[PDB]
Amino acid sequence: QARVVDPILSTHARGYRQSTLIGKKLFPVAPVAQYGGKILTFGKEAFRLYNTKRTKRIDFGYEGDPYSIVPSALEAKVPRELMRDASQVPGIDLGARSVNTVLRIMALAHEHECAQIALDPAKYNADHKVKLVGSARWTSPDSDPTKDVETAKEAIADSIGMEPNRLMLSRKALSACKYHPKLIERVKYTITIDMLKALWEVEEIVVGTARVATNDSFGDVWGPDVWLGYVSDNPDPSVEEPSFGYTYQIEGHPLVEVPYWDNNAKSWIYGVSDDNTPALSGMLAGYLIEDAGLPA
Amino acid sequence: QARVVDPILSTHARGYRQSTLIGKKLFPVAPVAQYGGKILTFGKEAFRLYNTKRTKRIDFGYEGDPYSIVPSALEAKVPRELMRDASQVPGIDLGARSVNTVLRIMALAHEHECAQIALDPAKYNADHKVKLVGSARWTSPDSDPTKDVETAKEAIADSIGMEPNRLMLSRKALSACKYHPKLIERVKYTRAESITIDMLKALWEVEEIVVGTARVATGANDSFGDVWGPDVWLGYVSDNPDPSVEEPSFGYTYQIEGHPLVEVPYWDNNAKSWIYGVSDDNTPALSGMLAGYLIEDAGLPAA
Amino acid sequence: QARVVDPILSTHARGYRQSTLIGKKLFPVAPVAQYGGKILTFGKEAFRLYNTKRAPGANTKRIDFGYEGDPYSIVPSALEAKVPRELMRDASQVPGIDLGARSVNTVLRIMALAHEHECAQIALDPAKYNADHKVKLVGSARWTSPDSDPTKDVETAKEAIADSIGMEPNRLMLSRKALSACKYHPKLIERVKYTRAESITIDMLKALWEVEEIVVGTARVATDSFGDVWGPDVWLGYVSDNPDPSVEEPSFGYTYQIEGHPLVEVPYWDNNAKSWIYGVSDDNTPALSGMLAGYLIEDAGLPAA
Amino acid sequence: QARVVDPILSTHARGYRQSTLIGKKLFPVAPVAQYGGKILTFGKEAFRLYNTKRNTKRIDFGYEGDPYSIVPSALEAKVPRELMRDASQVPGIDLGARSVNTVLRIMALAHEHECAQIALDPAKYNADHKVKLVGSARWTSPDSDPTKDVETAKEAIADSIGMEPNRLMLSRKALSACKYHPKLIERVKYTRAESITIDMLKALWEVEEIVVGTARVATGANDSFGDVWGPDVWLGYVSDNPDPSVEEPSFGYTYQIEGHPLVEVPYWDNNAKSWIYGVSDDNTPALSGMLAGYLIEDAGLPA
Amino acid sequence: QARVVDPILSTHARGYRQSTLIGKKLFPVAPVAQYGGKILTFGKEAFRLYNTKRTKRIDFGYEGDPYSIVPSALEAKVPRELMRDASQVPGIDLGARSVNTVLRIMALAHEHECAQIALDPAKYNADHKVKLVGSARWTSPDSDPTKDVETAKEAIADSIGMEPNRLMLSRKALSACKYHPKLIERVSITIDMLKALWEVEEIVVGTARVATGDSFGDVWGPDVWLGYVSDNPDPSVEEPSFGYTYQIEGHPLVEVPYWDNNAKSWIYGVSDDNTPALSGMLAGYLIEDAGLPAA
Amino acid sequence: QARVVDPILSTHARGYRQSTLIGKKLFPVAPVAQYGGKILTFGKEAFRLYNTKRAPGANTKRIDFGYEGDPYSIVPSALEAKVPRELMRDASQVPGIDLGARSVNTVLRIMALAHEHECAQIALDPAKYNADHKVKLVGSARWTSPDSDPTKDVETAKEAIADSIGMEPNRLMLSRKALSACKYHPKLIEITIDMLKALWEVEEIVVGTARVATDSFGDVWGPDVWLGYVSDNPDPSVEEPSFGYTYQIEGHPLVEVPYWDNNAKSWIYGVSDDNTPALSGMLAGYLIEDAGLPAA
Ligand SMILES: [Cl-]
Incomplete structure (x- = not known):
C-alpha cells in the first residue's frame, strides 16, 4: 500500500540538489517500477x-545481472522546541527543513554506492582499465595524464x-x-577544470570531492x-537507452508522507522514501x- | 485516413533536440503537404x-528534381515491466521517454541523409568544390585552411x-x-586560449x-x-x-506539415506493452547548389 | 476605406527583423498619418x-523644433503574400498561421x-550635404591606400557634426x-600593436x-x-x-511610416492562382530631416590606384 | 486642485530614461509632499x-538646513491633428507617449543643468572638500597626477x-x-585595452x-x-x-513631489488643432551632505 | 470632435433604468450616427x-419625414460640500450619483416626447384610432373596453x-x-x-406626470x-416596428470631470442625444x- | 485622524440587513461628508x-432642487465589537473572519x-407636518372601530401628497x-399586505413591528x-427630492483592524456607522x- 503523500513537500524533495556530489553525473536517475529485476545491459x-x-520497434539491451532496490525510508523530524505551537501540524518551511x-x-549513501560501482576494476575488461604504478602516477613529473586520458577516450x-x-577526477x-x-605548461599560454x-x-x-568517516x-x-x-x-533519462549507467529509482520518488505526531519523541514525523540503486549498464561506455592521485 | 493524435506527446516531440547533430543547420526544417513532388530549386x-x-506576387526558383518523402512511422513502446499498474494507460513521463x-x-537517419546530399561532389559544379590531395590536406603543415575557406566564401x-x-567542419x-x-600561431592575436570554433x-x-561529430556503424565488423x-x-x-521551402537558400528538410506527431497508445498483448505510433516524415533536399x-x-592524412 | 486586418499576422509582421540591413539604423521608423506632406526639418x-x-520664468508650455521643409510622398505599395494549395493538405480551408506567416x-x-536601397539613395547623396558636411576621397586619401588616415577623416566628421x-x-x-x-x-x-592584435574589428x-x-553596409543588389x-x-x-521614434524630434532622419503598418489583411482564395492571398501593406518613405546631424x-573604399 | 490623471501615460512617464544624463546619479530622486521647506541636512x-x-525607538539623522523651493513647472505635451488619421478621436497611447x-x-x-549648478559650485564646499587645479596641476598637463587628486578626494570624504x-x-x-x-x-600599455576606459x-x-558628464546646452547668443x-x-x-529617502544620509537628493511625473488626460485645443496632455514633474535638486x-x-582645462 | 469620455461612468450611465417610465417600451433605443436625416418609414x-x-440584400423602409437630434448635453455636478477633500477628483460613487x-x-424629457408622438391622432389614419365620447368612455359602466381593445388588435x-x-394603459x-x-365580472383587476x-x-x-403652466x-x-x-x-432602425428612439451611437456618455472654481464643484458633462420617431403607423x-369622465 | 480599516469585515458590515426593520424604507441611506451641516430641503x-x-438643449445646464434648511448633526457613535478569548482555541492570534464578523x-x-427608533421619532412627529398632511383619529374614526373607514383615510392621504x-x-x-x-x-x-x-x-x-422595553x-x-x-x-442621493434620507458618513459602516485588550482578555474591533435620519420633504x-388605538 501507498502512504498518504504530501505533494508540496514531495515536490520540494524532487528539487533537492547537492552540487558537490557527482554520483548522478555518472548514474543519472531513471524511473523503474520493480524493486527487484535484471539490469538492462548494453554490450558491444x-x-x-x-x-x-x-522493424517498427526498438530494443537495445539484454537482461543482465540482477538488481535489488532495498526499501530504505527514513523519518524526518520537527521537534516541538522549534515550534511556537507544537499542537498544530508544522508549517511547510519547518517540514521542508x-x-x-x-x-x-x-x-x-548514493554517492558512496556510485563510487563502489564505477571504481571497481572487477567490472571492466582489460582494455577499459589501467592501474598506474610508480612514475606513471600523476603525482610524478615523469607521468603523462594527457596520454592516459587520450587512451581512455579511444578505448570508449x-x-x-x-x-x-x-x-x-578525484x-x-x-x-x-x-x-x-x-x-x-598550458597555464602559461592561457589550472582549472575548464x-x-x-x-x-x-x-x-x-x-570527486566527497569524504566519508573511516577514530578521527x-x-x-x-x-x-x-x-x-x-x-x-x-x-x-531512461534505463532502456544505451549509456554507462543509471540510478534505478522507484517512479515518483522521492516521496514525503503527511506527518504524524510522535508523543514519545515529542515531534512531528514525516516519512521520506527515495528507493534507488545505481547500476552499471554499459561497461564499454x-x-x-x-x-592516478597516489604518491609515486 | 488520419490517426488519433496525442497533443501533449506531440508537443513534447516537437521540442526534441539533439544538439550534437547538425543536419538541420544545413537543411532547416520547412513545411510541405505533398509526399511526392518536385524540389523548388534556386539557380543563378x-x-x-x-x-x-x-508584380504584386513573388516567386523565386523552378520545379527541379523530384523528391519523395517515404512514410517511415515507428512505434514507441512502454513495457509493462516499467509500470506499477500496466492495466492503465502510461503517464506522460513514461510515454515521453x-x-x-x-x-x-x-x-x-536524418543526419546521415543530410551528409549524403551535402557532401556529394556530383551535386556541385567545378567552381563550387575542391578535392584536397597530399600536402594540400589540412593534416599537412604545408596546407592553408584559411585560403581554402576564403576561396569557398568568394565562390558563393x-x-x-x-x-x-x-x-x-567534420x-x-x-x-x-x-x-x-x-x-x-593565430591564437595569441585573439582573446581565445586555443583553437576553438569561436x-x-x-x-x-x-x-x-x-x-560534424556523428558516427554510424559501418560494415559487418566492428x-x-x-x-x-x-x-x-x-x-x-x-x-x-x-523556414519556407519557397525562400532561396542552400537546402531544406522538406517535412510533412504538423510532424512530428505522436498517436494515442494502444495495448499490444503479445508484446505486453503500450504502443505509441510516432511519425516524422521528411526528406532533406538540396535546393540551391550555388549557395x-x-x-x-581536408581531414585525411597528407600521406 | 480600411481593410479587414488579421491581427495575429499583423503582430507577426511587426516583429519581422532583418539584422544585416542597416537602413533603419540611419532612418528609424516613426509614425505619420499623411501619405503626402512636408518633412519636418531640423536646421541649426x-x-x-x-x-x-x-527658460525660467517663461509661461510657454509647448515646443516645436522643426520647420516644414521639402515635400514627401509615401507611395502606396501593397504586395500580396501567397500560400499555394500544393503546400496544403486541404486547400479548401484557410491556411494555418505557420503557412500565412511564411x-x-x-x-x-x-x-x-527596397527600403534599404532608398535609405542608401538618400544618405549617400552628396547633393544633400553642405561642403562642411562631406568629403570625397581621391587617390592616396582613399582608405585602401596605406597613406590614408581613416582616424583623421572620422575625427573631422565627428567635429563637423x-x-x-x-x-x-x-x-x-562603414560600407x-x-x-x-x-x-x-x-x-x-600600429595603433593597436601593444594589445597583441593582427587585424581590426568593429569593436x-x-x-x-x-x-x-x-x-x-553589407547588402548587395543585382546589377551577371x-x-x-x-x-x-x-x-x-x-x-x-x-x-x-518621433518625426518631431531632432535627428538626422526617419522612415515616415503610416501608423499601424505593417498590416496583413485576412486572406482570400484566388481560384486562378489556386492560392490563398494575404494583402500586405507597409507604406513608408525614408526622409532626411537633419542634414547637419x-x-x-x-x-573611402575605392582602390587608391 | 488635482487634475484628472492618465494612469497609463503616467506609468510610461515614470519609466522614462536618459542614460547619458547623470544628474540623478548625484541627486537621486526622492519623494516629498511640500513645495517649500527645509533641506534635511547631514553634517559630521x-x-x-x-x-x-x-531610550528612543525612533531613528533620525539629519537637521533642518537651508530652505528649498520646488517651482511648479508643468508643460503641455502636444499631438497635432496632422499626425492623426481621425483627429476627432483621442490619440492612441503611441502618439500620446511620444x-x-x-x-x-x-x-x-533642465534637471541635469540644475544638478551641475549645485554640485560644481565651490561656494558650497569647505576648504577640505575642494581643490582648484592651476597650470601643470591640470589633468591636460603630463606633469599632473590625477590618481593623487582622486585619492586625496577619497580620503577627505x-x-x-x-x-x-x-x-x-568625470566631465x-x-x-x-x-x-x-x-x-x-602607461597603465593601459600593460593590458590589452585599445584605450583608457572608465572600467x-x-x-x-x-x-x-x-x-x-557629457551633456551640453546652448551658451550665449550665437552658435x-x-x-x-x-x-x-x-x-x-x-x-x-x-x-531613495530624503531622511537618509547622502550627498544629495532631487526633492520631487510624490507621484511625479504625472500625465493628465488630454484636452482638444481647437486653436492649436492639437490634443494637449498636461505633464508635471515638479522637483528640485538639493545638496544635503556637503561633507560626503x-x-x-x-581638471580638464588646458595646462 | 470629441471630449475625453469617462468609460466607467459612461458604462454606469448606460445601465441607468427608470422602471416607471415606459417611453422606451414604445420607442426602443436604436443607434444612429446622423443628427439630422430622414425617418426610415414602414408603410403597408x-x-x-x-x-x-x-436579390441578396434586404431593405424595408422608405425615407420619410425628417428627424432632428438636438444636441442637449447637461452638466452633472459634485459640490465640494459633499467631499472631505475637494482638491481631489471625486470618487466614482459621488460621480455616479x-x-x-x-x-x-x-x-x-424623453418620456414626454414619446407621449407627444404616440398620442397624436394626426399621426394615424382613421382605421387606426378612435375618440371615445360620453358613455363609450371607460369611466362609464355602459362602455366596452374589451371590444375597443379587440378592434384595435384586429386593425393592427x-x-x-x-x-x-x-x-x-394610462x-x-x-x-x-x-x-x-x-x-x-371577469375576476383584483390587475395588469396580469x-x-x-x-x-x-x-x-x-403610463404613470409619469410633469409640471404644467400651476x-x-x-x-x-x-x-x-x-x-x-x-x-x-x-433594436435596429431598419427593422419594421411602430417606432424607435433614434440615439447617437455610444450615448449616453459621461466626460471626465473639470473643477469649476466659481461653482466650487466638479462638473461632469453628460450627453444622451436622441429623438423618438414614429416609423410604422400601421403598427x-x-x-x-378612455379615462375621461363620461359626463 | 483615520484608523486602519479591515476591508473584509467592512464589506461584511455593508451587507448587514435587518429585514423586519423599516426605518430605511422611509429614510434611505445616502452619503454625506460633513458631520454637521444643513438638510437639503424640498418644499413645493x-x-x-x-x-x-x-427640453434639449435649453439654457440651464445644471440641476439643483432643494434649499438649505434646518441644521443636522451626526454624532460620532462608534462602538467596540468584542471577541473574548474563551471563544478562541488560540487567543494569541488575530481572530478569524467568522468570529470577527459575529x-x-x-x-x-x-x-x-437606534436608527429605527430615530426614524420613528421623526416620521411620526405631528409637529413636523402642516395641517393638510396629518390627521388624528379619535373614537369611532380609529381603525379598531367597525364604524371607521381605513380606505377613505388612506385615499385622503394619497391625494394630499x-x-x-x-x-x-x-x-x-402600517404599525x-x-x-x-x-x-x-x-x-x-365586505386582509393581507398584498x-x-x-x-x-x-x-x-x-x-412597523419593532419594539422596545420601556416588565x-x-x-x-x-x-x-x-x-x-x-x-x-x-x-440614494441627499440632493434628490424625497420625503427623507438617512444622512450617513461616506464609506460607513467601517470596521477597524482589531486590537488586543489585555484587561478584557478580548480582541476589539472599532465599528463606526455615523448617521442621522433627516426629514427633507414634508410635503411628500x-x-x-x-389609527390602531382602541375605539373606547
Ligand atoms: Cl571547439
Whole structure:
C-alpha cells in the first residue's frame, strides 16, 4: 500500500540538489517500477545497433545481472522546541527543513554506492582499465595524464562509436594535475577544470570531492582514481537507452508522507522514501584509471 | 485516413533536440503537404531576382528534381515491466521517454541523409568544390585552411550576392585545425586560449561553425564511420526562424506539415506493452547548389 | 476605406527583423498619418533650441523644433503574400498561421530590401550635404591606400557634426569595402600593436573612434554581377536613440511610416492562382530631416590606384 | 486642485530614461509632499550617527538646513491633428507617449543643468572638500597626477563621513585628458585595452561607479554650446538605495513631489488643432551632505 | 470632435433604468450616427415585404419625414460640500450619483416626447384610432373596453400581419378598468389579468406626470394605445416596428470631470442625444379619452 | 485622524440587513461628508422643478432642487465589537473572519435599533407636518372601530401628497397595531399586505413591528399609519427630492483592524456607522395618528 503523500513537500524533495556530489553525473536517475529485476545491459551489440542507421520497434539491451532496490525510508523530524505551537501540524518551511536532513543522508549513501560501482576494476575488461604504478602516477613529473586520458577516450570511442562526455577526477588526481609540469605548461599560454576540458576535449569534468568517516579519520569517496565515460545527456533519462549507467529509482520518488505526531519523541514525523540503486549498464561506455592521485 | 493524435506527446516531440547533430543547420526544417513532388530549386537567376530591388506576387526558383518523402512511422513502446499498474494507460513521463527512443533513431537517419546530399561532389559544379590531395590536406603543415575557406566564401558570395553563413567542419577537419601550425600561431592575436570554433568563426568571418561529430556503424565488423567524413562544407543557409521551402537558400528538410506527431497508445498483448505510433516524415533536399561549396578530404592524412 | 486586418499576422509582421540591413539604423521608423506632406526639418536653430535649457520664468508650455521643409510622398505599395494549395493538405480551408506567416515574410523581405536601397539613395547623396558636411576621397586619401588616415577623416566628421548640433554623432556606417580597407590598415594596426592584435574589428574601431555604434553596409543588389547598396562610402550621424521614434524630434532622419503598418489583411482564395492571398501593406518613405546631424565621406573604399 | 490623471501615460512617464544624463546619479530622486521647506541636512554628526552601532525607538539623522523651493513647472505635451488619421478621436497611447517624451526630455535637461549648478559650485564646499587645479596641476598637463587628486578626494570624504565615496563624475573634458595622460597611458600599455576606459579607472581608483558628464546646452547668443559639467571632476558618497529617502544620509537628493511625473488626460485645443496632455514633474535638486562630496575644479582645462 | 469620455461612468450611465417610465417600451433605443436625416418609414409595403417568404440584400423602409437630434448635453455636478477633500477628483460613487440626476431629467424629457408622438391622432389614419365620447368612455359602466381593445388588435394585425404586443394603459384608463363592472365580472383587476383577458404580450402603464403652466398633468393623458413594437434585444432602425428612439451611437456618455472654481464643484458633462420617431403607423392604434369622465 | 480599516469585515458590515426593520424604507441611506451641516430641503417649488420638463438643449445646464434648511448633526457613535478569548482555541492570534464578523453583527444590531427608533421619532412627529398632511383619529374614526373607514383615510392621504408634489406616494407604513385592526375590519372584508397594496394602490406596504422595553415593551412605530413618496433610487442621493434620507458618513459602516485588550482578555474591533435620519420633504409625507388605538 501507498502512504498518504504530501505533494508540496514531495515536490520540494524532487528539487533537492547537492552540487558537490557527482554520483548522478555518472548514474543519472531513471524511473523503474520493480524493486527487484535484471539490469538492462548494453554490450558491444547494443551500442552498435544504437548507432546503426534505421522493424517498427526498438530494443537495445539484454537482461543482465540482477538488481535489488532495498526499501530504505527514513523519518524526518520537527521537534516541538522549534515550534511556537507544537499542537498544530508544522508549517511547510519547518517540514521542508526536516526533510532536507534525510535527503542529504540518502544523497551521501548514493554517492558512496556510485563510487563502489564505477571504481571497481572487477567490472571492466582489460582494455577499459589501467592501474598506474610508480612514475606513471600523476603525482610524478615523469607521468603523462594527457596520454592516459587520450587512451581512455579511444578505448570508449572505438567500443561504442561515441566520444566519452564525462571525466571524473578525484580530488587527489586534480591536485596532481595542478602540480604536473605537462599541465602547468598550458597555464602559461592561457589550472582549472575548464582548461582541462578544452585540453582533453571532454564535454564535462566532474570532481570527486566527497569524504566519508573511516577514530578521527576521513577517506575520499572517489579514491585516488580518474574515470571517463559516455553518460547520456538525455534530460529525461531512461534505463532502456544505451549509456554507462543509471540510478534505478522507484517512479515518483522521492516521496514525503503527511506527518504524524510522535508523543514519545515529542515531534512531528514525516516519512521520506527515495528507493534507488545505481547500476552499471554499459561497461564499454566506461574506462577506469586507478591510483592516478597516489604518491609515486 | 488520419490517426488519433496525442497533443501533449506531440508537443513534447516537437521540442526534441539533439544538439550534437547538425543536419538541420544545413537543411532547416520547412513545411510541405505533398509526399511526392518536385524540389523548388534556386539557380543563378533565382538568387539574382531574390536580391533585385523591385508584380504584386513573388516567386523565386523552378520545379527541379523530384523528391519523395517515404512514410517511415515507428512505434514507441512502454513495457509493462516499467509500470506499477500496466492495466492503465502510461503517464506522460513514461510515454515521453518511449517517444524519445524513436525520435533519436529518426534524428540519426536524418543526419546521415543530410551528409549524403551535402557532401556529394556530383551535386556541385567545378567552381563550387575542391578535392584536397597530399600536402594540400589540412593534416599537412604545408596546407592553408584559411585560403581554402576564403576561396569557398568568394565562390558563393560571387554566385548569389550574399556571404555564406554556415561552415561545417567534420570532426577530422576540426582536429587537423587544432594541430595546424599556421592556425596555432593565430591564437595569441585573439582573446581565445586555443583553437576553438569561436576563434575560427572570427578568423574566417563566418557567422556560425557547426562540427560534424556523428558516427554510424559501418560494415559487418566492428567499425564506426564518421557521418560527415573528412570533409569541410560552407554555405548560405537562410537564418529565417520560420523556414519556407519557397525562400532561396542552400537546402531544406522538406517535412510533412504538423510532424512530428505522436498517436494515442494502444495495448499490444503479445508484446505486453503500450504502443505509441510516432511519425516524422521528411526528406532533406538540396535546393540551391550555388549557395554551397564542398572541400573534400581536408581531414585525411597528407600521406 | 480600411481593410479587414488579421491581427495575429499583423503582430507577426511587426516583429519581422532583418539584422544585416542597416537602413533603419540611419532612418528609424516613426509614425505619420499623411501619405503626402512636408518633412519636418531640423536646421541649426532646431538643434540649438533642442539643447537650450528651459527658460525660467517663461509661461510657454509647448515646443516645436522643426520647420516644414521639402515635400514627401509615401507611395502606396501593397504586395500580396501567397500560400499555394500544393503546400496544403486541404486547400479548401484557410491556411494555418505557420503557412500565412511564411508567405508574409516573403513580401516583407522585398519591402525591406527596397527600403534599404532608398535609405542608401538618400544618405549617400552628396547633393544633400553642405561642403562642411562631406568629403570625397581621391587617390592616396582613399582608405585602401596605406597613406590614408581613416582616424583623421572620422575625427573631422565627428567635429563637423558636434559643432553644428551640440551632440556627438552616435552612428558610423562603414560600407563593406570601407571595412575591408580598415581590417589591415597600417596606421590602425600600429595603433593597436601593444594589445597583441593582427587585424581590426568593429569593436576596436568603436573604442578607437569613440562612436556609440558602428553599422556595416553589407547588402548587395543585382546589377551577371552584384552592386553594394552602401557603395564604397563611409557615413556618420547623430540618429536619435529614442525607443519610440518621433518625426518631431531632432535627428538626422526617419522612415515616415503610416501608423499601424505593417498590416496583413485576412486572406482570400484566388481560384486562378489556386492560392490563398494575404494583402500586405507597409507604406513608408525614408526622409532626411537633419542634414547637419550627418556627414558623408565618399569613396573611402575605392582602390587608391 | 488635482487634475484628472492618465494612469497609463503616467506609468510610461515614470519609466522614462536618459542614460547619458547623470544628474540623478548625484541627486537621486526622492519623494516629498511640500513645495517649500527645509533641506534635511547631514553634517559630521549625522553621518557619525548613521554608522554608530545600536531610550528612543525612533531613528533620525539629519537637521533642518537651508530652505528649498520646488517651482511648479508643468508643460503641455502636444499631438497635432496632422499626425492623426481621425483627429476627432483621442490619440492612441503611441502618439500620446511620444508627445510626452518631448516634454520629459526638456525637464530632464533642465534637471541635469540644475544638478551641475549645485554640485560644481565651490561656494558650497569647505576648504577640505575642494581643490582648484592651476597650470601643470591640470589633468591636460603630463606633469599632473590625477590618481593623487582622486585619492586625496577619497580620503577627505572617508575621514569626514566614515565611508568611501561611491560615485566619481568625470566631465567629458576630464575624461579626454585621462585618455591622453602619460601616467594613465602607461597603465593601459600593460593590458590589452585599445584605450583608457572608465572600467580601468574604476579599478585603478577603486570607486564603485564612474559617471561621465557629457551633456551640453546652448551658451550665449550665437552658435556656442557649453558643457553642463564644465571642465570639472567630482567625487561623493551618494545613496545606492533603490527606494531613495530624503531622511537618509547622502550627498544629495532631487526633492520631487510624490507621484511625479504625472500625465493628465488630454484636452482638444481647437486653436492649436492639437490634443494637449498636461505633464508635471515638479522637483528640485538639493545638496544635503556637503561633507560626503568633493570638487576638483578645472581638471580638464588646458595646462 | 470629441471630449475625453469617462468609460466607467459612461458604462454606469448606460445601465441607468427608470422602471416607471415606459417611453422606451414604445420607442426602443436604436443607434444612429446622423443628427439630422430622414425617418426610415414602414408603410403597408414594408410590413408585407417583411413577412414575405423569400436579390441578396434586404431593405424595408422608405425615407420619410425628417428627424432632428438636438444636441442637449447637461452638466452633472459634485459640490465640494459633499467631499472631505475637494482638491481631489471625486470618487466614482459621488460621480455616479451626480450623473443619475441629469439622466433622470433626460429620461423625463424623453418620456414626454414619446407621449407627444404616440398620442397624436394626426399621426394615424382613421382605421387606426378612435375618440371615445360620453358613455363609450371607460369611466362609464355602459362602455366596452374589451371590444375597443379587440378592434384595435384586429386593425393592427390585419394591416401588418402580426399581433400587437404592447398595450399602453394610462393611469386614468387603468383606474377605470379597476372600477368597470364588465371587467369586475371577469375576476383584483390587475395588469396580469388584463394581459390574459386581452391576449397582449405586455401591458405598460403610463404613470409619469410633469409640471404644467400651476399644477401637474399626466404625460400619457387619459388615453389607451396598442402596437407592434419589435421585441428585438438589439433594436435596429431598419427593422419594421411602430417606432424607435433614434440615439447617437455610444450615448449616453459621461466626460471626465473639470473643477469649476466659481461653482466650487466638479462638473461632469453628460450627453444622451436622441429623438423618438414614429416609423410604422400601421403598427399602432390610438384610443383617445378612455379615462375621461363620461359626463 | 483615520484608523486602519479591515476591508473584509467592512464589506461584511455593508451587507448587514435587518429585514423586519423599516426605518430605511422611509429614510434611505445616502452619503454625506460633513458631520454637521444643513438638510437639503424640498418644499413645493423643489418638487415642482423636479417634474418640470427640460427640453434639449435649453439654457440651464445644471440641476439643483432643494434649499438649505434646518441644521443636522451626526454624532460620532462608534462602538467596540468584542471577541473574548474563551471563544478562541488560540487567543494569541488575530481572530478569524467568522468570529470577527459575529462580533461586529452584535454592534450593528444595536445601531440598527437606534436608527429605527430615530426614524420613528421623526416620521411620526405631528409637529413636523402642516395641517393638510396629518390627521388624528379619535373614537369611532380609529381603525379598531367597525364604524371607521381605513380606505377613505388612506385615499385622503394619497391625494394630499399627490396634489402637493405631483407624484403618488409609494410607501405606506402600517404599525403592527394598525395592521391588526385592518385584518378583521368589516368594511375591508365586505386582509393581507398584498391585498391592501392592490386595494389601496400603493407600491410598497411596510409594517412597523419593532419594539422596545420601556416588565412591558413599547411599539417603536406606535399605533400610527404613515404614507409618503420615498425615492426608489438604488443609489440614494441627499440632493434628490424625497420625503427623507438617512444622512450617513461616506464609506460607513467601517470596521477597524482589531486590537488586543489585555484587561478584557478580548480582541476589539472599532465599528463606526455615523448617521442621522433627516426629514427633507414634508410635503411628500402624511401622518395618520392613533389609527390602531382602541375605539373606547
Ligand atoms: Cl571547439
